[PDB]
Design a protein around this ligand. Structure first.
Ligand SMILES: Nc1nc2c(ncn2[C@H]2C[C@H](O)[C@@H](COP(=O)(O)OP(=O)(O)OP(=O)(O)O)O2)c(=O)[nH]1
Ligand SMILES: [Mn+2]
Ligand SMILES: [Mn+2]
Ligand SMILES: [Mn+2]
Ligand SMILES: [Zn+2]
Length: 993
DNA sequence: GAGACGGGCAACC
DNA sequence: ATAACGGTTGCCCGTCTC
């Protein structure tokens, strides 16, 4: 039975063992089945192949799963396609994992009080879940989490705690300075927990030096509910007579192996530990044998070695070798300390360890309920705001329909505590417009007519209808025959004679708040990217400085980074590893925390009767002490259910269409949603006056948000939508894995249902299930499950069958990995059609706005040369297929629209010293003049400088241009070589003040 | 050795 | 071409320059 690291050449016959971390099965022309596994025994890894000799073995083959352990007998061969050695197995048997066992008697078990999770930045490696589970298996009555300077594992620890019925001790290894050493803080109770959240806050904010730290006095102020331990060899006392020590509730000692970095010798460690045993007995302080865990098993050590190594000589823990700091069993812990004799061993490994655990109560680090803000007037204001606005549109008294929608909507929004955020959202939007920036609608608030009446969304969710902007007469349609009011033919009010308005997308309110009202949604707004910061800052003014926080993110190592680390470590160490072994080393590094950052726009709101520390510590993103905002230490996900979020997001749509308006004078609200020439671009190139061959595309949506994509254009080719609601159906199925491909598309092509019967937004699932007779709350629960790609539970299936839901519909729900709410789809389409209006009727305005706002990757020389030059660049990139770099893909996207622009008759001029702007493509006759910042290397800063300079006074020489325009040599040549500078002398033979 | 700039990556909607 | 979810903010780190 051979260890994998000893498999080095081709060989007729080996027996080998390992954890299978990947396994796929496939059929061969012959009818034979092939099993392809990757296994590791943790000394190395290897790919295993097996060829079935009968259908019995073939299906057994399908039973081999990730997580099994397997013994394989077979031959070692060079596989020339996979480019590695590989086992061809003739024999396979599942075996027990037979893992490290904890052999001490029940109730006589150890407790781990000093332990690191992957949240100890780049420093520990085994998830807190695995660790907690291992503890349960071993029978430990408790386990502590004590990450460096942070508590970012608390949320996962709690979950695992509840799942596994394990008692977790919520801790912190902190940096203390005297007014820089390690102490262990264990929280006994909620007072202690809150103090931890406070400490981690102050250490990251008021007291961050090069590292978060806590002055000892600040610790004392916040000590209540904490037990304090002396911790590592980087601890205060280990680093040396007695007063220092009496400061602690328990005294830490690590297995001698842990201290092996060396002090003078190995005998000194053994004595020092004794000097600490002596100290603790003398002072009646419990002495505890803690392990300083950084990973589960002894061999998991390599993953840590790889991470740390990635940080260069800029770490100085690469100086010496790394200690064995895996999770030690109670019996093996006794062994490490046998040298103190059997009574002390048992005292400090178990009795005291258990005793400390027993001084710890049952703490819940994350709350169960939602805390909702209060601001006087809010409930009442939202009520009057919406009844008044509705009445002025729909008349007094209101139509029954409208009236019932308000009554039902308001009692829910108010009762579940959402009126405040509706109102704040209204104010955010209103300030943005006053400030000159329109706002794009988004997300599920559009399901709410109250949201519509409060101008928090442009989406009107009522059934399709006509309303008169004059006399205000209505006509609604519930036949369900009409998809959205936007599809209606223009029509005049059969009363006052005046031209009808059309609206209503028939969206159920419950997509937003559900039925119990026990879901916690947010409100999503698309502010322009230019403006987003300002909307953020306005919430400080509205709620008060200390009642909002930007959601913080935790940046972990994912696949691409892990592979990078592993390869570089291989390279540096002169290892040639098999593919399979690179994979598994990579997989061992993922999940480890690397940085912190900022949620892309969510502001978390603290009710005035609570405080942030009831929920999470706070800090600076990436520890930037100059940052304008403080972030939550926990991410939004961890506290999703406790506090409302305002998704104040950034987006190009609002900026693009704002510029389209500032350039044309046209009010985008007056743009028609059934202009045949505009809607034609969603299925043809006719409206654009160009040939498909001319622009390398069969439909007219190049550059249109969402619809200009290659995947989506193809969908459009085969679905040919003309209608607003048909476009809405496409929006829905063009977003999310397994919605269209291998699902809806197959269903239409099969004949099993029509394009309009396929599941195209999460709302349709709910509405259909209600129709089919299921209980609305359950129909809602099922909708929410599938749109998060959680599939269906056995109960859901049973309820569905019981009510005659066809087997294809059930199966289609199980596939969907993600899905829009209709209100998002309608918002986005509305925006897409407005822009389209410009693409058709004001082409050059459309392109100026495109290249100014959306584009960041250019081939200017190609673009200037024109059609043929662009086409050639495009073909160069097409040739690389899916092996194109993101950057090539970003480029391709913009070139596609450039070529279209040229074909439509327009063109690009060279950079122009006196007409080029800083960041905006300007219109000149039938051309765009590119801005300075389009030049590779020339960022926004210089661009603006060049413009500022020339406004101060013309350039008098290439040299004058160079100095006052702050241009590097390289960029000066860029302009030079293109003839931009020909009209100027190199330098001036005179200069005056 | 400080600061602009862009690529590559991760988180999130 | 194949298969294909689209679009946004933000952080780190290497490169090039003055
Ligand atoms: N294309 C795409 N769009 C997304 C994705 N996730 C979210 N969005 C867009 C569509 C969503 O309606 C909106 C996301 O906002 P949220 O995360 O707040 O979800 P939503 O509002 O749909 O549900 P909620 O009522 O808040 O639970 O932004 C995604 O994975 N792909
Ligand atoms: Mn330490
Ligand atoms: Mn430690
Ligand atoms: Mn939302
Ligand atoms: Zn009328």
């Amino acid at each position: 039975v051979r260890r994998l690291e000893t498999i080095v050449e081709e060989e007729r016959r080996v027996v080998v063992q390992g954890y299978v971390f990947d396994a796929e099965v496939s059929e061969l022309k012959s009818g034979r089945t092939l099993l392809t596994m990757k296994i590791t025994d943790y000394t190395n890894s290897i790919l295993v192949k097996m060829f079935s000799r009968d259908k019995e073995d073939a299906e057994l083959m399908s039973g081999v799963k990730k997580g099994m352990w397997v013994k394989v007998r077979g031959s070692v061969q060079n596989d020339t396609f996979v480019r590695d050695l590989v086992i061809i197995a003739n024999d396979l048997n599942e075996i027990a994992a037979n893992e490290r066992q904890d052999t001490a008697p029940e109730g006589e078990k150890r407790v781990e009080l000093h332990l690191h999770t992957p949240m100890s930045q780049m420093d520990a490696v085994t998830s807190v879940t695995k660790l907690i589970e291992q503890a349960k298996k071993w029978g430990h009555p408790a386990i502590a989490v004590t990450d460096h300077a942070v508590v970012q594992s608390f949320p996962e620890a709690y979950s695992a705690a509840k799942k596994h019925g394990m008692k977790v001790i919520y801790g912190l290894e902190a940096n203390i300075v005297d007014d820089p050493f390690h102490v262990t803080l264990l929280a006994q109770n909620e007072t202690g927990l809150k103090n931890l959240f406070k400490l981690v806050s102050l250490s990251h904010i008021q007291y961050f030096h090069r590292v978060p730290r806590i002055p000892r006095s600040v610790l004392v102020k916040h000590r209540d509910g904490l037990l304090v331990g002396s911790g590592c060899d980087k601890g205060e006392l280990f680093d040396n007579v007695e007063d220092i020590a009496r400061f602690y509730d328990f005294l830490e000692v690590h297995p001698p192996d842990v201290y092996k970095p060396l002090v003078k010798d190995e005998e000194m460690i053994k004595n020092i530990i004794r000097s600490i045993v002596a100290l603790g007995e003398k002072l009646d302080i419990p002495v505890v044998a803690t392990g300083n865990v950084h990973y589960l098993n002894p061999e998991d050590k390599i993953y840590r070695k790889i991470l740390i190594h990635s940080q260069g000589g800029a770490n100085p823990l690469n100086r010496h070798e790394l200690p064995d700091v895996y999770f030690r069993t109670t019996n093996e812990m006794l062994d490490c300390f046998s040298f103190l004799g059997p009574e002390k061993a048992k005292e400090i490994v178990v009795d005291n360890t258990q005793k400390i655990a027993s001084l710890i109560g049952d703490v819940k680090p994350i709350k169960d309920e939602l805390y909702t803000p209060r601001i006087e007037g809010a409930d009442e204001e939202i009520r009057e705001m919406s009844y008044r606005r509705a009445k002025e549109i729909y008349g007094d008294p209101l139509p029954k329909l409208v009236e019932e929608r308000l009554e039902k909507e308001l009692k829910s929004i108010i009762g579940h505590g959402f009126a405040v955020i509706y109102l704040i959202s209204h104010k955010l939007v209103k300030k943005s417009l006053d400030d000159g920036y329109l706002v794009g609608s988004r997300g599920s608030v559009g399901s709410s007519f109250v949201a519509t009446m409060t101008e928090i969304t442009e989406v009107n969710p009522l059934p399709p209808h006509y309303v008169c902007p004059n006399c205000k007469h209505s006509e609604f349609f519930n036949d369900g025959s009409v998809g959205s009011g936007f599809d209606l033919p223009d029509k005049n009010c059969p009363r006052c004679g005046t031209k009808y308005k059309k609206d209503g997308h028939d969206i159920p309110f419950e997509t937003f708040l559900g039925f119990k009202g026990d879901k916690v949604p947010d409100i999503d707004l698309n502010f322009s990217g230019e403006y987003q910061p300002r909307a953020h800052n306005y919430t400080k003014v509205l709620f008060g400085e200390d009642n909002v926080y930007r959601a913080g993110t935790i940046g972990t190592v994912a696949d691409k980074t892990a592979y990078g680390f592993v390869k570089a470590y291989a390279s540096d160490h002169n290892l040639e590893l098999r593919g399979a072994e690179i994979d598994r080393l990579a997989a061992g590094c993922t999940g480890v925390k690397r940085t912190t950052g900022q949620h892309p726009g969510g502001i978390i709101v603290v009710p005035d009767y609570m405080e942030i520390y009831d929920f999470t510590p706070i800090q600076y993103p990436a520890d930037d002490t100059s940052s304008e905002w403080r972030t939550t230490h926990f991410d939004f996900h961890s506290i999703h259910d406790n506090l409302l979020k305002l998704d104040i997001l950034g987006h190009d749509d609002p900026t693009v269409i704002r510029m389209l308006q500032d350039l044309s004078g046209i009010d985008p609200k007056t743009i028609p949603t059934d202009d045949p020439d505009v809607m034609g671009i969603f299925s043809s190139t006719e409206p654009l006056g160009v040939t498909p061959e001319q622009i390398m595309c069969n439909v007219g949506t190049i550059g249109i948000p969402e619809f200009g994509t290659r995947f989506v254009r193809q969908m459009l080719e085969e679905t040919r939508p003309k209608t607003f609601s048909e476009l809405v159906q496409i929006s829905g199925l063009s977003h999310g894995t397994d919605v269209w491909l291998g699902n809806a598309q197959e269903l239409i092509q099969n004949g099993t249902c029509t394009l309009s019967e396929v599941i195209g937004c999460r709302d349709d699932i709910m509405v259909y299930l209600i129709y089919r007779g299921l209980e609305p709350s359950l129909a809602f629960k099922i909708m929410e499950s599938v749109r998060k790609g959680k599939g269906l539970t056995p109960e859901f299936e049973a309820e569905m069958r019981k009510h005659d839901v066809p087997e294809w519909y059930i199966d289609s729900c199980k596939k969907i990995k993600y899905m829009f709410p209709k209100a998002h789809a309608a918002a986005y389409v509305l925006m897409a059609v407005r822009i389209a209006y410009f693409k058709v009727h004001h082409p050059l305005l459309y392109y100026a706005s495109y290249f100014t706002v959306r584009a960041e990757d250019f081939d200017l020389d190609a673009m200037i040369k024109g059609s043929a030059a662009i086409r050639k660049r495009i073909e160069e990139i097409n040739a690389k297929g899916i092996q194109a770099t993101a950057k090539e893909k970003s480029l391709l996207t913009v070139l596609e629209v450039a070529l279209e622009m040229c074909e439509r008759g327009f063109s690009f001029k060279n950079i122009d010293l006196y007409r080029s702007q800083a960041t905006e493509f300007v219109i000149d006759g039938n051309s765009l003049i590119p801005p300075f910042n389009a030049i590779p290397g020339l960022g926004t800063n210089v661009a603006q400088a060049i413009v500022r300079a020339r406004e101060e006074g013309e350039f008098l020489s290439k040299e004058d241009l160079q100095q006052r325009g702050k241009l590097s040599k390289t960029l000066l040549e860029y302009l030079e070589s293109r003839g931009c500078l020909d009209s100027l002398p190199d330098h001036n033979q005179l200069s005056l003040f």
